[PDB]
Amino acid sequence: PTMYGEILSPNYPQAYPSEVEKSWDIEVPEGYGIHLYFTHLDIELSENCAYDSVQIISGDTEEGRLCGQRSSNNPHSPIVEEFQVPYNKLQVIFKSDFSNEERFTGFAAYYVATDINECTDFVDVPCSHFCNNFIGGYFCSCPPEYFLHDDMKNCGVNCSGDVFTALIGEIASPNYPKPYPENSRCEYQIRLEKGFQVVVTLRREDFDVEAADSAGNCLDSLVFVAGDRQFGPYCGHGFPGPLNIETKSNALDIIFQTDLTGQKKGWKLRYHGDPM
Amino acid sequence: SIPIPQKLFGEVTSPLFPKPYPNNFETTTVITVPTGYRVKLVFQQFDLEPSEGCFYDYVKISADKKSLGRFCGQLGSPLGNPPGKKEFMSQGNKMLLTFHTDFSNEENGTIMFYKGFLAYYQAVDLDECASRSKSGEEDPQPQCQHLCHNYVGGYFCSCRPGYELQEDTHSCQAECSSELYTEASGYISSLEYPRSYPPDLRCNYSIRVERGLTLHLKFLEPFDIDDHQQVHCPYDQLQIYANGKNIGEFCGKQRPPDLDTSSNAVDLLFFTDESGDSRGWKLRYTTEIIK
Ligand SMILES: *[C@@H]1O[C@H](CO)[C@@H](O[C@@H]2O[C@H](CO)[C@@H](O[C@@H]3O[C@H](CO[C@H]4O[C@H](CO)[C@@H](O)[C@H](O)[C@@H]4O)[C@@H](O)[C@H](O[C@H]4O[C@H](CO)[C@@H](O[C@@H]5O[C@H](CO)[C@H](O[C@@H]6O[C@H](CO)[C@@H](O)[C@H](O)[C@H]6NC(C)=O)[C@H](O)[C@H]5O)[C@H](O)[C@@H]4O)[C@@H]3O)[C@H](O)[C@H]2NC(C)=O)[C@H](O)[C@H]1NC(C)=O
Ligand SMILES: *[C@@H]1O[C@H](CO)[C@@H](O[C@@H]2O[C@H](CO)[C@@H](O[C@@H]3O[C@H](CO)[C@@H](O)[C@H](O)[C@@H]3O)[C@H](O)[C@H]2NC(C)=O)[C@H](O)[C@H]1NC(C)=O
Ligand SMILES: *[C@@H]1O[C@H](CO)[C@@H](O)[C@H](O)[C@H]1NC(C)=O
Ligand SMILES: [Ca+2]
Ligand SMILES: [Ca+2]
Ligand SMILES: [Ca+2]
Ligand SMILES: [Ca+2]
Ligand SMILES: [Ca+2]
Numbered sequence: 001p002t003m004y005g006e007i008l009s010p011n012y013p014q015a016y017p018s019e020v021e022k023s024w025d026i027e028v029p030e031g032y033g034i035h036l037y038f039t040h041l042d043i044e045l046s047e048n049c050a051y052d053s054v055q056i057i058s059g060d061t062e063e064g065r066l067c068g069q070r071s072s073n074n075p076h077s078p079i080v081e082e083f084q085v086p087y088n089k090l091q092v093i094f095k096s097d098f099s100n101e102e103r104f105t106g107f108a109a110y111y112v113a114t115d116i117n118e119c120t121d122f123v124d125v126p127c128s129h130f131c132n133n134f135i136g137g138y139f140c141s142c143p144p145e146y147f148l149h150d151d152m153k154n155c156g157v158n159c160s161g162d163v164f165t166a167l168i169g170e171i172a173s174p175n176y177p178k179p180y181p182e183n184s185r186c187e188y189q190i191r192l193e194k195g196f197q198v199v200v201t202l203r204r205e206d207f208d209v210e211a212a213d214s215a216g217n218c219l220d221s222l223v224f225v226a227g228d229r230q231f232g233p234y235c236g237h238g239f240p241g242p243l244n245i246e247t248k249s250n251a252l253d254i255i256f257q258t259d260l261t262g263q264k265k266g267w268k269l270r271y272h273g274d275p276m
Numbered sequence: 277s278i279p280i281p282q283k284l285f286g287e288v289t290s291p292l293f294p295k296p297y298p299n300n301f302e303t304t305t306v307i308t309v310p311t312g313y314r315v316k317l318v319f320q321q322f323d324l325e326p327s328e329g330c331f332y333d334y335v336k337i338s339a340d341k342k343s344l345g346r347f348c349g350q351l352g353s354p355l356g357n358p359p360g361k362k363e364f365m366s367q368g369n370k371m372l373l374t375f376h377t378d379f380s381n382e383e384n385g386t387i388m389f390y391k392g393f394l395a396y397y398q399a400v401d402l403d404e405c406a407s408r409s410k411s412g413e414e415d416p417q418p419q420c421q422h423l424c425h426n427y428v429g430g431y432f433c434s435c436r437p438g439y440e441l442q443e444d445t446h447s448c449q450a451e452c453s454s455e456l457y458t459e460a461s462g463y464i465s466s467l468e469y470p471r472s473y474p475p476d477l478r479c480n481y482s483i484r485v486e487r488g489l490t491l492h493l494k495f496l497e498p499f500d501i502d503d504h505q506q507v508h509c510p511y512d513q514l515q516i517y518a519n520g521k522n523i524g525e526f527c528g529k530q531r532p533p534d535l536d537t538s539s540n541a542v543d544l545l546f547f548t549d550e551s552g553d554s555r556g557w558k559l560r561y562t563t564e565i566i567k
């Protein structure tokens with residue numbers, strides 16, 4: 001239960017006793033990884049570290065097994081072997097048999113607790129839009145005019161009632177990436193300076209809406225209105241339009257119509273500006 | 277908005293954020309993390325009055341004793357000098373921020389609304405080791421001789437094999453008191469051989485083998501100890517006790533003769549002066565049997 005620690009062989013730096021099995025349980029507080037490194041290594045040499053060995057087990061898995069005589073080659077660094085783990089607990093088990101051919105001084109190692117950068121250190125990111133790391137934990141953040149869900153993990157946008165003024169911003173369907181609500185009409189408005197042009201980007205795979213009927217009429221529809229020009233209506237699984245769209249307009253209205261049943265994942269998009 | 281000494285992270289907003297900021301306004305807010313920490317920070321939103329060279333409005337961020345940035349404008353427009361998302365780390369524990377805005381934010385005879393900015397800052401631990409100011413540390417002694425350790429907040433030090441850390445926790449002495457040897461054969465050498473041996477030492481290299489064996493001591497070349505031809509060993513002495521009794525006090529340039537002890541217990545005592553010019557000694561000890 002420390003932020004740092006030292007582990008030495010018994011009777012260091014003299015010869016170690018035979019027929020021994022000593023264990024140490026490393027523990028650091030929540031949200032810390034562990035960096036365990038060896039400054040001195042002089043152990044009885046055996047194939048697959050059979051006779052004598054020092055063992056590194058994290059939880060249930062054996063993180064390493066070391067033996068032999070080795071000293072630091074670099075004069076600028078004392079480290080000989082090292083390991084880095086994203087866990088807050090460790091176990092080290094050093095064992096030696098009943099005989100030693102020569103005098104072996106054992107080993108000298110140290111461990112330090114390192115912060116987990118939860119945004120980058122993990123494969124799964126526990127934030128829908130933006131991740132904030134801090135020493136000992138994390139918390140999520142959201143784009144302009146996004147509201148955090150009570151699960152403190154995913155962000156949401158309101159279906160209607162907001163006025164966008166930023167040049168570059170994000171817009172999504174409500175509850176995204178959860179399924180969109182039924183029987184809703186969502187109108188979002190983007191307003192830039194007269195001299196600027198709204199250019200809209202959205203990924204082809206971030207689009208899944210109830211498919212059209214046999215005749216090709218969208219039962220649920222999404223549609224982009226730019227004054228007189230109009231892009232849509234779009235529906236189905238996968239965005240059919242191009243991924244980069246220039247509207248040639250400073251004001252844009254996005255409309256989303258859904259019926260009672262036939263819901264799907266939804267959509268997400270992001271717009272930036274280009275002068276005129 | 278969160279200047280406090282004991283605080284890990286925090287948020288810094290433009291005035292009235294998200295509501296647009298007022299004209300004729302300049303405010304300096306200073307971030308301070310506790311001792312032994314750097315200050316990282318980025319901008320999520322950034323919407324200021326643009327100007328070539330940032331003459332009208334700007335955000336001026338400065339490190340310990342150096343102005344790192346002075347940036348203005350909007351997040352995406354090529355108007356010039358937006359930070360966007362870039363990292364801005366300090367060296368010490370203090371980061372000075374400033375926000376300036378002149379009287380006119382309405383370019384080209386029409387009205388314009390500029391929000392401000394959203395800055396996030398985290399604290400970081402600094403690597404005291406990697407600083408490496410080898411010379412010029414007399415008021416503090418923040419660097420150690422054999423090895424230091426970088427951990428969060430503070431730092432601690434440690435010595436090479438066979439050395440003890442003294443009270444200052446910055447320098448090391450030699451232990452060299454209970455140096456034990458019970459193996460069959462073996463090698464015994466003065467500390468840091470063949471480099472100069474440390475001064476002011478009282479070493480007891482104790483060999484204790486299983487009873488029923490006789491010890492054979494073979495000295496190695498080189499064998500360099502500060503000697504004197506008038507009286508032998510005035511500064512440094514290498515006494516040898518065998519079977520409880522002294523068997524010779526050695527020092528000099530030529531190695532002592534190979535010894536046969538007829539004993540299972542020997543003790544090599546090593547006494548040093550207060551200077552190291554000579555190199556030292558090394559010996560192989562082996563065991564033979566009797567009837
Ligand atoms: C450099 O290091 C060496 C390391 O060996 C030092 O050598 C030691 O020198 C000192 C004297 O300067 C001395 O150590 C002490 O010895 C006494 C016993 O000496 C008695 O002998 C005289 C002889 O006339 C009597 O008249 C007195 O009554 C003396 O008292 C101990 O009492 C001392 O205190 C502790 O020592 C151990 C540790 O607990 C305990 O056991 C005693 O130790 C001695 C050995 O010193 C005996 O040895 C054992 O005998 C058994 C017999 O079955 C054998 O297996 C084996 O030889 C020994 N085994 C073990 C396990 O020791 C007994 O064990 C027992 O009397 C004491 O009860 C007490 O707690 C102190 O040990 C000694 O001459 C040597 N050797 C050792 C090991 O100490 C040298 O001094 C150092 N250099 C300098 C400058 O100091
Ligand atoms: C989506 O956008 C806004 C977000 O600003 C939605 O407004 C919601 O309801 C009220 C609006 O006044 C705000 O929270 C409420 O504030 C009252 C003030 O007294 C307070 O008593 C309550 O705690 C309540 O939460 C807030 O703007 C927002 N709140 C929530 C929980 O969403 C708005 O309904 C949506 N549509 C439009 C067009 O803005
Ligand atoms: C700002 O620029 C526009 C377009 O170049 C121009 O028509 C307008 O007159 C300018 N504003 C003023 C106050 O001149
Ligand atoms: Ca053994
Ligand atoms: Ca963290
Ligand atoms: Ca539906
Ligand atoms: Ca201004
Ligand atoms: Ca540190």
Ligand SMILES: [Ca+2]
Pocket residue numbers: 475502511512548549550551552553554
């Ligand atoms: Ca000397």
Ligand code: NA
Pocket residue numbers: 009010011012013014015016104105106107
């Ligand atoms: Na040891």
Ligand code: NA
Pocket residue numbers: 173174175176177178179180181264265266267
């Ligand atoms: Na959805």
Ligand code: NA
Pocket residue numbers: 466467468469470471472473555556557
């Ligand atoms: Na030496």
